[PDB]
Scaffold this active site. Structure first.
Site, PDB file in Angstrom:
ATOM      1  N   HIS A  10       0.611   3.833   6.101  1.00  0.00           N
ATOM      2  CA  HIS A  10       0.855   2.433   5.809  1.00  0.00           C
ATOM      3  C   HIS A  10       2.272   1.928   5.736  1.00  0.00           C
ATOM      4  O   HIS A  10       2.527   0.867   6.292  1.00  0.00           O
ATOM      5  CB  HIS A  10       0.177   2.057   4.525  1.00  0.00           C
ATOM      6  CG  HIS A  10      -1.318   2.065   4.714  1.00  0.00           C
ATOM      7  ND1 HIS A  10      -2.057   1.237   5.443  1.00  0.00           N
ATOM      8  CD2 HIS A  10      -2.155   2.965   4.103  1.00  0.00           C
ATOM      9  CE1 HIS A  10      -3.305   1.593   5.290  1.00  0.00           C
ATOM     10  NE2 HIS A  10      -3.355   2.627   4.485  1.00  0.00           N
ATOM     11  N   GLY A  11       3.214   2.637   5.126  1.00  0.00           N
ATOM     12  CA  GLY A  11       4.571   2.138   5.030  1.00  0.00           C
ATOM     13  C   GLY A  11       5.280   2.277   6.368  1.00  0.00           C
ATOM     14  O   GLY A  11       5.922   1.335   6.846  1.00  0.00           O
ATOM     15  N   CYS A  42      -8.009   5.477   2.781  1.00  0.00           N
ATOM     16  CA  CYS A  42      -8.801   4.472   2.098  1.00  0.00           C
ATOM     17  C   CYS A  42     -10.232   4.436   2.627  1.00  0.00           C
ATOM     18  O   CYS A  42     -11.117   4.021   1.875  1.00  0.00           O
ATOM     19  CB  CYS A  42      -8.188   3.082   2.267  1.00  0.00           C
ATOM     20  SG  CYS A  42      -6.460   2.925   1.737  1.00  0.00           S
ATOM     21  N   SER A 110       8.946   6.530   4.770  1.00  0.00           N
ATOM     22  CA  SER A 110       7.784   6.296   3.947  1.00  0.00           C
ATOM     23  C   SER A 110       7.094   7.647   3.755  1.00  0.00           C
ATOM     24  O   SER A 110       6.002   7.923   4.279  1.00  0.00           O
ATOM     25  CB  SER A 110       6.892   5.298   4.661  1.00  0.00           C
ATOM     26  OG  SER A 110       5.939   4.710   3.784  1.00  0.00           O
ATOM     27  N   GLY A 112       5.612   9.073   1.220  1.00  0.00           N
ATOM     28  CA  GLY A 112       4.357   9.136   0.502  1.00  0.00           C
ATOM     29  C   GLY A 112       4.378  10.141  -0.634  1.00  0.00           C
ATOM     30  O   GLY A 112       5.433  10.528  -1.164  1.00  0.00           O
ATOM     31  N   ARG A 132      -7.142  13.832   0.343  1.00  0.00           N
ATOM     32  CA  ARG A 132      -6.147  12.970   0.963  1.00  0.00           C
ATOM     33  C   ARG A 132      -6.030  13.467   2.402  1.00  0.00           C
ATOM     34  O   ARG A 132      -6.011  14.686   2.617  1.00  0.00           O
ATOM     35  CB  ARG A 132      -4.777  13.073   0.239  1.00  0.00           C
ATOM     36  CG  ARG A 132      -3.674  12.218   0.915  1.00  0.00           C
ATOM     37  CD  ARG A 132      -2.321  12.147   0.193  1.00  0.00           C
ATOM     38  NE  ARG A 132      -2.421  11.261  -0.959  1.00  0.00           N
ATOM     39  CZ  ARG A 132      -1.578  10.259  -1.254  1.00  0.00           C
ATOM     40  NH1 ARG A 132      -0.503   9.939  -0.522  1.00  0.00           N
ATOM     41  NH2 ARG A 132      -1.871   9.523  -2.320  1.00  0.00           N
ATOM     42  N   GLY A 243      -3.651  13.364  -9.583  1.00  0.00           N
ATOM     43  CA  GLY A 243      -2.425  12.614  -9.512  1.00  0.00           C
ATOM     44  C   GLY A 243      -1.753  12.921  -8.216  1.00  0.00           C
ATOM     45  O   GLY A 243      -2.212  13.720  -7.390  1.00  0.00           O
TER      46      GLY A 243
HETATM   47  C1  LIG Z   1      -8.790   8.807  -0.898  1.00  0.00           C
HETATM   48  C2  LIG Z   1      -7.821   7.635  -1.084  1.00  0.00           C
HETATM   49  C3  LIG Z   1      -8.327   6.339  -1.186  1.00  0.00           C
HETATM   50  C4  LIG Z   1      -7.453   5.252  -1.284  1.00  0.00           C
HETATM   51  N1  LIG Z   1      -7.958   4.007  -1.258  1.00  0.00           N
HETATM   52  C5  LIG Z   1      -7.163   2.916  -1.291  1.00  0.00           C
HETATM   53  C6  LIG Z   1      -7.717   1.641  -1.268  1.00  0.00           C
HETATM   54  O1  LIG Z   1      -8.932   1.491  -1.138  1.00  0.00           O
HETATM   55  N2  LIG Z   1      -6.874   0.527  -1.326  1.00  0.00           N
HETATM   56  C7  LIG Z   1      -5.489   0.704  -1.396  1.00  0.00           C
HETATM   57  O2  LIG Z   1      -4.735  -0.270  -1.456  1.00  0.00           O
HETATM   58  N3  LIG Z   1      -4.981   1.950  -1.412  1.00  0.00           N
HETATM   59  C8  LIG Z   1      -5.771   3.037  -1.358  1.00  0.00           C
HETATM   60  N4  LIG Z   1      -5.213   4.328  -1.369  1.00  0.00           N
HETATM   61  C9  LIG Z   1      -3.741   4.484  -1.500  1.00  0.00           C
HETATM   62  C10 LIG Z   1      -3.022   4.299  -0.166  1.00  0.00           C
HETATM   63  O3  LIG Z   1      -3.732   5.019   0.841  1.00  0.00           O
HETATM   64  C11 LIG Z   1      -1.565   4.767  -0.268  1.00  0.00           C
HETATM   65  O4  LIG Z   1      -0.924   3.912  -1.224  1.00  0.00           O
HETATM   66  C12 LIG Z   1      -0.794   4.674   1.058  1.00  0.00           C
HETATM   67  O5  LIG Z   1      -1.353   5.563   2.028  1.00  0.00           O
HETATM   68  C13 LIG Z   1       0.652   5.125   0.877  1.00  0.00           C
HETATM   69  O6  LIG Z   1       1.348   4.949   2.096  1.00  0.00           O
HETATM   70  P1  LIG Z   1       2.734   5.705   2.373  1.00  0.00           P
HETATM   71  O7  LIG Z   1       3.132   5.328   3.747  1.00  0.00           O
HETATM   72  O8  LIG Z   1       3.681   5.354   1.289  1.00  0.00           O
HETATM   73  O9  LIG Z   1       2.379   7.262   2.232  1.00  0.00           O
HETATM   74  P2  LIG Z   1       1.320   8.354   2.745  1.00  0.00           P
HETATM   75  O10 LIG Z   1      -0.006   7.739   2.901  1.00  0.00           O
HETATM   76  O11 LIG Z   1       1.451   9.526   1.851  1.00  0.00           O
HETATM   77  O12 LIG Z   1       1.804   8.771   4.217  1.00  0.00           O
HETATM   78  C14 LIG Z   1       3.012   9.495   4.442  1.00  0.00           C
HETATM   79  C15 LIG Z   1       2.875  10.019   5.852  1.00  0.00           C
HETATM   80  O13 LIG Z   1       4.154  10.456   6.299  1.00  0.00           O
HETATM   81  C16 LIG Z   1       4.062  11.821   6.723  1.00  0.00           C
HETATM   82  N5  LIG Z   1       5.314  12.531   6.361  1.00  0.00           N
HETATM   83  C17 LIG Z   1       5.750  12.754   5.112  1.00  0.00           C
HETATM   84  N6  LIG Z   1       6.949  13.343   5.122  1.00  0.00           N
HETATM   85  C18 LIG Z   1       7.248  13.478   6.403  1.00  0.00           C
HETATM   86  C19 LIG Z   1       8.340  13.938   7.047  1.00  0.00           C
HETATM   87  N7  LIG Z   1       9.343  14.439   6.327  1.00  0.00           N
HETATM   88  N8  LIG Z   1       8.433  13.895   8.392  1.00  0.00           N
HETATM   89  C20 LIG Z   1       7.442  13.412   9.134  1.00  0.00           C
HETATM   90  N9  LIG Z   1       6.333  12.968   8.558  1.00  0.00           N
HETATM   91  C21 LIG Z   1       6.230  12.976   7.215  1.00  0.00           C
HETATM   92  C22 LIG Z   1       2.850  12.398   6.030  1.00  0.00           C
HETATM   93  O14 LIG Z   1       2.226  13.392   6.857  1.00  0.00           O
HETATM   94  C23 LIG Z   1       1.935  11.200   5.901  1.00  0.00           C
HETATM   95  O15 LIG Z   1       1.106  11.125   7.060  1.00  0.00           O
HETATM   96  C24 LIG Z   1      -6.065   5.453  -1.311  1.00  0.00           C
HETATM   97  C25 LIG Z   1      -5.566   6.754  -1.210  1.00  0.00           C
HETATM   98  C26 LIG Z   1      -6.437   7.843  -1.089  1.00  0.00           C
HETATM   99  C27 LIG Z   1      -5.856   9.247  -0.905  1.00  0.00           C
END
Ligand SMILES: Cc1cc2nc3c(=O)[nH]c(=O)nc-3n(C[C@H](O)[C@H](O)[C@H](O)COP(=O)(O)OP(=O)(O)OC[C@H]3O[C@@H](n4cnc5c(N)ncnc54)[C@H](O)[C@@H]3O)c2cc1C
Ligand SMILES: Cc1cc2nc3c(=O)[nH]c(=O)nc-3n(C[C@H](O)[C@H](O)[C@H](O)COP(=O)(O)OP(=O)(O)OC[C@H]3O[C@@H](n4cnc5c(N)ncnc54)[C@H](O)[C@@H]3O)c2cc1C
Ligand SMILES: Cc1cc2nc3c(=O)[nH]c(=O)nc-3n(C[C@H](O)[C@H](O)[C@H](O)COP(=O)(O)OP(=O)(O)OC[C@H]3O[C@@H](n4cnc5c(N)ncnc54)[C@H](O)[C@@H]3O)c2cc1C
Ligand SMILES: Cc1cc2nc3c(=O)[nH]c(=O)nc-3n(C[C@H](O)[C@H](O)[C@H](O)COP(=O)(O)OP(=O)(O)OC[C@H]3O[C@@H](n4cnc5c(N)ncnc54)[C@H](O)[C@@H]3O)c2cc1C
Lengths: 447, 447, 447, 447
Positions: A10-11, A42, A110, A112, A132, A243
């Site tokens: 997402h980010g 999600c 992003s 995560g 996840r 968590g």
């Molecule tokens: C089961 C579940 C259900 C959820 N349901 C909801 C919901 O219904 N509604 C809602 O709003 N939110 C929901 N969420 C929360 C939401 O999915 C997260 O807030 C969101 O995915 C976070 O996005 P992000 O980009 O910050 O990180 P992440 O989703 O953690 O993605 C980070 C990505 O970057 C990659 N990465 C990390 N470090 C590196 C690196 N150094 N180099 C290359 N790649 C890398 C990782 O492989 C990963 O694919 C849910 C989460 C889960 C696990």
């Protein structure tokens, strides 16, 4: 300009999209260490429950479609380090092992979060899973239909823990949710709501063991038992949804991090380093209910932050507008939604609030389609500004929480909402709708 | 203090309730000329369609329950005149014929409106009905099951006209809706919405004859034909739902009235006479989308106005907060909701607006429960402040219009809503929900 | 040949059809005294309940379609007398009053039956209705939606009485069924079935007052009360469905009649007069369960008899094959079916029977779609030949009664049915299906 | 007396039950070579489709419950040979390897059948499965949710083949059914039925490749392709449901066997050896439609035969009553049922038949719940005795086939069924029901 975006979730993704909007000129590189681009965790429950059959359709972008718009997608490539000073990044192709250096003009990351694991005895026993990502999703689906799985224990009674519990209970397993917290879903709902939800889940073969610390996993080779300080439970599979921990260890010393690992950023998504921006689960976000900043690991938040980072790429012109922390979920026959400050958030923040709860049919009594609805309106004692709300019903009334999210942002009061214009039509609501009624009760309580 | 409240419907009733809140001390008299206290005409369709079986349950107050709280209820008693100067009112007991004078310290009136009747040839032919009140409701239900009724013509393609059309079509009659306006429901929805709704109704035995003026009713003793300038239609029953006229003829010269009969009042509900307040269909209301005042004959509006009149009974301290004109209704498989300025309202007001419409599935493509949703966001060209929105789907997404109602009141912009925090969970919505997506399209359109 | 057929209902109609099959050569006249040809009173409940909207579609022939095949249809024309000797009939056109004589070579009559009316005080009070024919159907539908009807009393707890009770209860009225018999539907089902049905109806606002003789109707001009020897009940509408009386008064002395008015006929449908044949409710039928003849006023029976009369028009060559008295009906969530001898029929006939009842899920226990089913198999003590059966479930298992109807006709035994080949597939039944299981229990009981 | 019963499935089990009925005195030993007692393969589809969640509940007896009634159950013990002369049997405990000899006074065997495997190239490639028994059921359920399975090819378009196809299509896989026969389900239904069923399945992602001989399986280690003489198909999983072969190889020379392996037995279930009885899939059964004997591998048949063997244990007193071959199954929205002779059976038997098919709504046209129903009645040209029938509809009308099964056994004619008493009530059927109407059409065809 060469912009590197780390992460395909997402980010990372909304950053690539916003770069295409505002900078179609730029060379964009999109990095993802995993084998799959943009999987939507999600949607994992819809998949596990069998509403969505193909695990690979639970996404919102393919790498192959992004390359068609001129983005250089590097799946299976991990960014191992950042050299902000030099404006370089170290990346490693995990298929070939070959490391290389890549240059950038702007970097948006992003990273995560990573599931927190309980470092206790028996931590390496087989069948202690996480929830996840795609890989865990397919493994968990294998287990829903496994005839050797009878008892499932999920540790963590939050959002993910309850999704996992519902999916395995619906699949026919005996489930026990275990947590030290005394209420399931307390981060989202208050007690008058979580008691009904507990009762609903118990009616569906789920025991909810609150107030218990997990001490050790027992079993020969694979789990067989989960032992807590108050009790021990048989387990053929464990799902650990307690968590998340910021995926920032690799950044320590490169970027300034808060004591818990979150990347320090300002309202323009800039890190302590010039030209490095950070978004998503690994950061804090402006939280409008209390004009503060908190960590809310939600997809909505990551998405908007990703776009705002690109908006502020060359200069700080668009301050982030803030969020209210909104959620919604169905738990068996009930659908709830929540935004702003509730008990748990008020305690974390140390904020005194006042609130009223109205529990009555949401349609007028002569209409047989009437059903009971719960609505709690939380407000500021002094100003009576709307600080939060929670609602629940077997009828889907969740879209009303979107009105409350804006009321909080706008700093509306209970008197504003008491007389706010909401349509009335007796197949849909009562003369004074669910929000109006709660707000009128709140002014009554402040007489 | 002796407070007289005229009318037992939405404006009158909420005034009595607010008097009990803020003035439990007062002598309250509640007058209603009809035989029934607080019938809800908003529920007439649920009744005609057979979802609600007892016509007498479609209410929200009995006279008998109000007397239990010390209110003097006079049903079948009409207030015939007001002497503001003297602070007296002339009332007539319609059962006995006996007139009397009644004194007051404050008078709050909610006279409402009367259905407009087409003064054309054949106006007094039997079976030309109206749709307002209990008496008309039971007569219309008689006709739904009458085996001699085959063709029903409803004149007026507004809210009431379409409810009447749906009820009679569902009951098995051939219906034709006739209006000079070229679009059904144009006061609520724009063309991309009303074309889908027309098509939906046509699939259900309803012809919608737009752009036609009704000239005369034909028939021997009872209607047999409705003749328009473009065509003639067989009719066994006619339902006239073309408009409403303020029930204010009796007040001309006592109170100042606008050229169309609406009572002139200020934001505190005071009429031109001291101690006489007026509310409901017979008045104008502050309309926040364009910071003006318009006549919007809705129950929500009457209810809030009724309470605000009591709030300002002794002194002007609570200015009315304004409304956005919100509506919602199901028309066969579709549910729509609307608030603020749309095409018809913009033309009446002479306001230039800009807008975007997004028509796509409201859930992500991998989820088979996905359904198409229509959402149009109307905004100010100059400021990009949210001025209105309309949505429609076979899924019930109407509660989202409550968020937009507040966004307009708060003077939020398309950029505010584009990044506004709305929860995401894939069983309920897409990463950027229905409001977010429309607002992002609107910023895209203003690049 | 000129063949006159009296009556446009089931007996008359199938006779006209069979005349077209076997005698396309003949001049056929079809007489009906009412204004409507072939109304199906068997569909009156579907209509009253709102499943069928148009009363005029509840038919199976129009007069207009029969004339197209060369039949001379005389609706509104009553045959007033028969002169068998002369082979003439007296007919009267009820529109014009003009009587005439008509000649015939063969006459087939299906006069049917008239509802029995209780000759007690208050018999001529308004709103004491009957339930047979189109005219009563539309009047009863008027009353289902009448807001002045609150309490409905139906006298007679048979097939029609319970249809009437269900329709008015579903429509929202308080119903009481009153009868001297101590069990509702006893002609069709035995006590283990009627107790469940009573309980089901009571759960739906129906009081069933058994063992009570109605003495008088009370009310000023219209009914207001029904008084029995044990109690008195308020009534706004009464539906009298206690019995039927052969419409044969006009034939007394022309044709030989049994003491109760039924026309004496043989197995070839011939009356005591040559060339006059009679069929339907007004006759007895060969009843195969006990090799006797009984009066069973059912449409199936009238239909087959009508055809067999034409089959034997010129000479007695096709003896009627006999019937088993089969019925089936849904009463709220339950569907039952019955054929042959049950308790009430055995008592009327004076026949000793033996029986077993099996009450268990009809699907194997591992299948969650399993539901409870009741099946009672009645058999001859001496020969163990199948004499009757009754079944009931919320699942529709009624078509199984068709197998039992043939088993009785074929004089099959409990051992035949215990091992009879009935398919097995676990979504549909158990290894030994509902009939097999009951029959195995019956052999167990005869060990 | 010591009675040994071989097999814990339908034939073996009902024999043990009947021994408890008629011989509670005897020492009973029940042998099963597999690890599980009485698994119901008839319920495998309900399980694979997720209607039944626990594979272990799909049974009708536990070994543990039979021992409670004094039966000596030996699971995992195979009877390897019979010495009829000596009245001994050789058994082998498969857990321990220890062989032993066991004595008997009477032996009843129900060995069943083994799936026929295509001895072609690639026969030993992984993922070529079968569908019979618990072990295959759990393996097939593993594959329904396997994300690596996309294309499934099932060879054999009979009953089992179509269950397998429906389960995998419903689970989300692309299916192709392949067979040399030119019609799916031809053993059960004729062409007017199988064309509708083909069309229905094609609408659900199933290609049905008729008229093709499978030549070879292709793939590296696991299947990847199925090659036929007309085409080649991708396959990730193959399900082989082409036939069954009697499990009698071990008995050759001990008992007399027909050229295809079926055990020769008479109508009392006695084999060529005194005191050895045989039942189930491995035997022929009296087939009443043509007064012959055929092999019909159905559970119903095995069950009744198992009981009749015990009935004739000491002397031939109960001749088997015969079966009609009845079946029923739902295929996506359609439910069909069949009994007696259809085209395929008539060709195998060389019997000339005549037939009529009626395809029309099964309820009268005024009832909106009406749905199309197909019914074909097959009869003898000379005698017009009922020889078979097939029916199909989206409404469940299958229980009517039970009436036809008895009509065939009873040697009823088309004239018998044309006027047979079947109840009429318009929510359930037409005046002349589905059987009556077909039979009347058959007499019309014999005019
Ligand atoms: C089961 C579940 C259900 C959820 N349901 C909801 C919901 O219904 N509604 C809602 O709003 N939110 C929901 N969420 C929360 C939401 O999915 C997260 O807030 C969101 O995915 C976070 O996005 P992000 O980009 O910050 O990180 P992440 O989703 O953690 O993605 C980070 C990505 O970057 C990659 N990465 C990390 N470090 C590196 C690196 N150094 N180099 C290359 N790649 C890398 C990782 O492989 C990963 O694919 C849910 C989460 C889960 C696990
Ligand atoms: C069929 C229909 C459906 C509708 N559906 C909706 C909907 O779904 N949502 C919504 O928001 N709105 C709906 N409305 C509109 C809403 O009902 C009106 O806006 C509201 O009733 C107006 O309230 P009021 O008190 O101003 O007037 P009224 O409803 O007109 O009531 C005035 C009352 O005062 C009495 N009265 C008048 N003069 C005198 C007198 N001189 N003395 C004594 N008594 C007097 C009258 O008998 C009447 O009972 C609908 C209206 C109709 C007719
Ligand atoms: C409400 C109700 C529900 C029923 N439901 C079922 C059911 O579900 N299944 C079932 O099998 N049966 C049912 N029946 C019974 C079935 O309808 C009757 O058995 C069947 O109608 C009897 O047919 P008939 O021709 O003998 O007589 P009738 O139906 O009585 O018809 C006689 C006709 O002949 C006309 N007539 C009489 N005398 C003269 C004359 N002298 N000259 C000219 N015309 C004349 C009458 O007007 C009448 O139209 C039900 C009956 C009722 C009332
Ligand atoms: C998927 C499927 C669906 C079906 N659906 C239906 C249906 O819906 N309706 C219907 O009527 N029929 C159905 N059938 C057919 C029905 O299941 C069979 O006709 C019935 O099981 C045959 O019973 P049996 O006892 O003759 O043999 P089997 O079922 O073959 O059982 C023989 C048993 O004996 C054991 N055994 C064999 N030899 C030895 C030995 N030497 N020593 C010890 N143990 C031994 C075997 O392990 C086996 O457990 C279906 C079959 C299948 C496979």
């Amino acid at each position: 300009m060469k912009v590197i975006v780390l992460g395909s979730s997402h980010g990372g993704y909304e950053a690539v999209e916003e770069l295409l909007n505002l900078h179609p000129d730029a060379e964009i590189q999109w990095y993802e260490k995993g084998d799959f681009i943009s999987f939507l965790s999600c949607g994992m429950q819809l998949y596990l429950e069998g509403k969505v059959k193909d695990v690979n359709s639970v996404r919102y972008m393919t790498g192959e479609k992004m390359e068609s718009r001129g983005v250089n997608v590097f799946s299976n490539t991990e960014i191992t380090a950042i050299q902000p000073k030099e404006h370089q990044v170290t990346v490693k192709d995990l298929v070939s092992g070959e490391e290389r250096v890549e240059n950038y003009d702007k970097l948006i990351i992003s990273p995560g979060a990573v599931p927190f694991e309980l470092d206790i005895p028996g931590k390496d026993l087989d069948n202690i899973y996480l929830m996840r990502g795609r890989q865990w999703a397919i493994k968990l689906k294998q287990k829903t239909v496994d005839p050797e799985v009878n008892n499932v224990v999920v540790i963590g009674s939050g959002y993910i823990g309850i999704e996992a519990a519902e999916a395995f209970a619906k699949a026919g397993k005996k489930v026990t949710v275990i947590d030290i917290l005394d209420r399931p879903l307390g981060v989202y709902l208050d007690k008058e709501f979580t008691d009904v939800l507990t009762e609903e889940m118990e009616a569906n073969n789920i025991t909810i063991a609150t107030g218990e610390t997990v001490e050790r996993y027992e079993g020969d080779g694979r789990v067989q038992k989960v032992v807590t300080d108050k009790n021990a439970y048989d387990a053929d599979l464990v799902v650990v949804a307690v968590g998340v921990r910021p995926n920032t260890a690799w950044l320590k010393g490169t970027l300034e991090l808060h004591p818990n690992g979150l990347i320090k950023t300002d309202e323009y998504m800039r890190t302590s380093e010039p030209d490095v921006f950070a978004v998503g689960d690994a950061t804090l976000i402006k939280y409008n209910p209390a004009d503060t900043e908190v960590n809310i690991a939600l997809a909505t938040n990551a998405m908007k932050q990703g776009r705002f980072a690109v908006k502020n790429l060359e200069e700080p012109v668009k301050p982030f507008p803030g969020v209210q922390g909104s959620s919604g979920l169905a738990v068996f026959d009930y659908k709830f939604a929540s935004t702003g400050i509730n008990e748990v958030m008020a305690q974390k923040l140390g904020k005194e609030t006042k609130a009223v709860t109205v529990v009555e049919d949401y349609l007028m009594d002569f209409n047989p389609d009437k059903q009971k609805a719960w609505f709690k309106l939380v407000y500021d004692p002094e100003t009576t500004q709307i600080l939060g709300a929670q609602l629940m019903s077997k009828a889907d009334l969740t879209a009303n929480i979107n009105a409350i999210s804006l009321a909080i942002q706008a700093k509306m009061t209970i008197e504003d909402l008491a007389y706010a214009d909401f349509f009335f039509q007796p197949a849909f609501d009562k003369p004074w709708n669910i929000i109006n009624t709660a707000a009128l009760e709140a002014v009554k309580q402040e007489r």
